[PDB]
Amino acid sequence: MGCTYTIQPGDTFWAIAQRRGTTVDVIQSLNPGVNPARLQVGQVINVPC
């Protein structure tokens, strides 16, 4: 099912968006139940492929 990514130390939706070639609003839409200010290292999120 699409692609997944594990939150690493220092990650933010902005930084993840930039690596994946997208925007924060798309990362949020793929992870609608995730608070971007409450990430934990080791959490698994959905990302574009």
Residue 42: is it exposed, middle or buried by C-beta count within 10 angstroms (0-12/13-18/19+)? exposed
Resolution (A): 1.2
At 19, which CATH number?
A: 3.10.350.10
With vertex at residue 25, the alpha carbon angle to CA 48 and CA 45, rounded to the nearest 5 degrees, is 45
Method: X-ray
Range of the domain at 19: 1-49
Task: Work out how many domains the chain is built from and give that number.
Answer: 1
In this structure, what token pair is assigned to residue 13?
Answer: 């939706």
Asked if 49 contacts 3 with a C-beta cutoff of 8 angstroms, the reply is yes
Of residues 30, 25, 49, 44, the one with CA closest to residue 11:
44
**Distance between terminal CA atoms of the chain?**
10
In this structure, what token pair is assigned to residue 11?
Answer: 């990650």
Contacts of 26 (CB under 8 A, 6+ apart): 17, 48
**Alpha-carbon distance 27 to 23, whole Å?**
6
What single DSSP character describes residue 45? E
